[PDB]
Design an enzyme around this catalytic site. Structure first.
Site, PDB file in Angstrom:
ATOM      1  N   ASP A  89       0.800  -1.219   0.000  1.00  0.00           N
ATOM      2  CA  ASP A  89       0.000   0.000   0.000  1.00  0.00           C
ATOM      3  C   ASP A  89       0.839   1.280   0.000  1.00  0.00           C
ATOM      4  O   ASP A  89       0.269   2.364  -0.091  1.00  0.00           O
ATOM      5  CB  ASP A  89      -1.054   0.017   1.124  1.00  0.00           C
ATOM      6  CG  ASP A  89      -0.475  -0.060   2.538  1.00  0.00           C
ATOM      7  OD1 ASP A  89       0.547  -0.679   2.734  1.00  0.00           O
ATOM      8  OD2 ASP A  89      -1.172   0.445   3.465  1.00  0.00           O
ATOM      9  N   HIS A 150       3.624   0.397  13.431  1.00  0.00           N
ATOM     10  CA  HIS A 150       3.023  -0.504  12.471  1.00  0.00           C
ATOM     11  C   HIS A 150       4.057  -1.359  11.763  1.00  0.00           C
ATOM     12  O   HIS A 150       3.803  -2.523  11.440  1.00  0.00           O
ATOM     13  CB  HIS A 150       2.242   0.349  11.468  1.00  0.00           C
ATOM     14  CG  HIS A 150       1.803  -0.402  10.262  1.00  0.00           C
ATOM     15  ND1 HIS A 150       0.715  -1.257  10.235  1.00  0.00           N
ATOM     16  CD2 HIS A 150       2.371  -0.497   9.046  1.00  0.00           C
ATOM     17  CE1 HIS A 150       0.626  -1.811   9.035  1.00  0.00           C
ATOM     18  NE2 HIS A 150       1.612  -1.350   8.291  1.00  0.00           N
TER      19      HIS A 150
HETATM   20  C1  LIG Z   1      -0.776  -3.793   2.560  1.00  0.00           C
HETATM   21  C2  LIG Z   1      -0.910  -4.686   3.781  1.00  0.00           C
HETATM   22  O1  LIG Z   1      -0.060  -4.379   4.844  1.00  0.00           O
HETATM   23  C3  LIG Z   1       0.094  -5.511   5.703  1.00  0.00           C
HETATM   24  C4  LIG Z   1       0.732  -6.830   5.220  1.00  0.00           C
HETATM   25  C5  LIG Z   1       0.583  -7.981   6.019  1.00  0.00           C
HETATM   26  C6  LIG Z   1       1.139  -9.209   5.648  1.00  0.00           C
HETATM   27  C7  LIG Z   1       1.820  -9.319   4.425  1.00  0.00           C
HETATM   28  C8  LIG Z   1       2.436 -10.664   3.996  1.00  0.00           C
HETATM   29  N1  LIG Z   1       3.645 -10.874   4.771  1.00  0.00           N
HETATM   30  C9  LIG Z   1       1.947  -8.165   3.653  1.00  0.00           C
HETATM   31  C10 LIG Z   1       1.416  -6.942   4.037  1.00  0.00           C
HETATM   32  C11 LIG Z   1      -2.307  -4.740   4.295  1.00  0.00           C
HETATM   33  C12 LIG Z   1      -3.193  -5.684   3.757  1.00  0.00           C
HETATM   34  C13 LIG Z   1      -4.519  -5.741   4.167  1.00  0.00           C
HETATM   35  C14 LIG Z   1      -5.015  -4.880   5.130  1.00  0.00           C
HETATM   36  C15 LIG Z   1      -4.126  -3.941   5.733  1.00  0.00           C
HETATM   37  C16 LIG Z   1      -4.281  -3.003   6.747  1.00  0.00           C
HETATM   38  C17 LIG Z   1      -5.566  -2.682   7.507  1.00  0.00           C
HETATM   39  C18 LIG Z   1      -5.941  -1.370   7.763  1.00  0.00           C
HETATM   40  C19 LIG Z   1      -7.104  -1.057   8.475  1.00  0.00           C
HETATM   41  C20 LIG Z   1      -7.889  -2.071   8.955  1.00  0.00           C
HETATM   42  C21 LIG Z   1      -9.152  -1.648   9.746  1.00  0.00           C
HETATM   43  S1  LIG Z   1      -8.916  -1.551  11.592  1.00  0.00           S
HETATM   44  C22 LIG Z   1      -7.723  -0.278  11.935  1.00  0.00           C
HETATM   45  O2  LIG Z   1      -8.475  -2.891  12.041  1.00  0.00           O
HETATM   46  O3  LIG Z   1     -10.134  -1.194  12.310  1.00  0.00           O
HETATM   47  C23 LIG Z   1      -7.517  -3.391   8.696  1.00  0.00           C
HETATM   48 CL1  LIG Z   1      -8.530  -4.714   9.252  1.00  0.00          CL
HETATM   49  C24 LIG Z   1      -6.345  -3.696   7.964  1.00  0.00           C
HETATM   50  C25 LIG Z   1      -3.056  -2.379   6.900  1.00  0.00           C
HETATM   51  C26 LIG Z   1      -2.657  -1.369   7.907  1.00  0.00           C
HETATM   52  O4  LIG Z   1      -3.071  -1.592   9.108  1.00  0.00           O
HETATM   53  O5  LIG Z   1      -1.823  -0.470   7.582  1.00  0.00           O
HETATM   54  N2  LIG Z   1      -2.184  -2.870   6.032  1.00  0.00           N
HETATM   55  C27 LIG Z   1      -2.784  -3.846   5.296  1.00  0.00           C
HETATM   56 ZN   LIG Z   2       1.771  -1.491   6.302  1.00  0.00          ZN
HETATM   57 ZN   LIG Z   3      -1.260   0.225   5.800  1.00  0.00          ZN
END
Ligand SMILES: C[C@@H](OCc1ccc(CN)cc1)c1cccc2c(-c3ccc(CS(C)(=O)=O)c(Cl)c3)c(C(=O)O)[nH]c12
Ligand SMILES: [Zn+2]
Ligand SMILES: [Zn+2]
Length: 232
Positions: A89, A150
């Site tokens: 992202d 994060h």
């Molecule tokens: C691009 C990727 O980043 C991590 C990632 C994880 C694993 C892997 C594989 N190793 C790759 C990338 C990603 C992938 C999918 C979701 C996220 C979110 C996210 C942001 C908000 C909420 C709502 S809430 C605050 O919970 O109410 C939720 Cl559910 C999720 C965020 C964030 O929090 O910035 N980022 C996301």
């Molecule tokens: Zn991230």
């Molecule tokens: Zn993010």
């Protein structure tokens, strides 16, 4: 029609801009990941007759659409981009930017992590950000490394002309109930990193999270609260 956009206004592949302040916009796009759809934010800051971009629109096609939307709505060239951590992202779309004449930048820590994980890699390294509390100028913004949150590499961005604090994914929106995707996070250090942001930018008027709605300084305390509760 004027409120901050959400996925219900944003099909995956389209990009919207939102005017935050004079010469400051956010960009909003949506993407699918592991079978769910998410919004994400970035920033655009006017830099004389050019634009500085903060973060991609989460994917190659989204980022192409971002460039088209900027041309339609603003009409000034994007000349530089900064990615605020190594996740898709933030860097997914850097190859599109680089082929559209945009010079792409990230910290060495972000570049290493992106390379190791197979994500797109910004071209230029941003030195001077390796210790928590470090700050450097980059055109019309200040880049600040608050510490691990994060992710270990996450940067925040301040627009001094407008008192806009772009927290990126180290900062959550007020409606959030958990700390988002924490796979690469440091939940124990995250509150301390947020406290560093709060101390460094006490005059912030708008705070923009990495995902979801902007608000005021309360987003910082709310973030600390949701992360502390998540760790529990
Ligand atoms: C691009 C990727 O980043 C991590 C990632 C994880 C694993 C892997 C594989 N190793 C790759 C990338 C990603 C992938 C999918 C979701 C996220 C979110 C996210 C942001 C908000 C909420 C709502 S809430 C605050 O919970 O109410 C939720 Cl559910 C999720 C965020 C964030 O929090 O910035 N980022 C996301
Ligand atoms: Zn991230
Ligand atoms: Zn993010």
């Amino acid at each position: 029609s004027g409120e901050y956009p959400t996925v219900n206004e944003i099909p995956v592949g389209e990009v919207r801009l939102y005017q935050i302040a004079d010469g400051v916009w956010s960009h909003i796009a949506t993407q699918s990941f592991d079978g769910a759809v998410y919004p994400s934010n970035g920033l655009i800051v006017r830099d004389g007759d050019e634009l500085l971009l903060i973060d991609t629109a989460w994917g190659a096609k989204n980022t192409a659409a971002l460039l088209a939307e900027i041309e339609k709505q603003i009409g000034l060239p994007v000349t530089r981009a900064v990615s605020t951590h190594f996740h898709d992202d933030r860097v997914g779309g850097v190859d599109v930017l680089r082929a559209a004449g945009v010079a792409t930048y990230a910290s060495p820590s972000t570049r290493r992590l992106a390379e190791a994980e197979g994500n797109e890699i910004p071209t230029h390294s941003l030195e001077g950000l390796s210790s928590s509390g470090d700050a450097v100028r980059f055109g019309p913004v200040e880049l600040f490394y608050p510490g691990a949150a994060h992710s270990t590499d996450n940067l925040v961005v301040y627009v001094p002309s407008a008192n806009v604090l772009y927290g990126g994914c180290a900062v959550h929106e007020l409606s959030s109930t958990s700390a988002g995707n924490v796979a690469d996070a440091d939940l124990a250090e995250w509150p301390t990193s947020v406290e560093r942001i709060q101390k460094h930018y006490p005059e912030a008027e708008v705070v923009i999270p990495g995902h979801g709605l902007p608000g005021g300084l309360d987003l910082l305390q709310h973030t600390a609260n949701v992360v502390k509760a998540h760790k529990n």
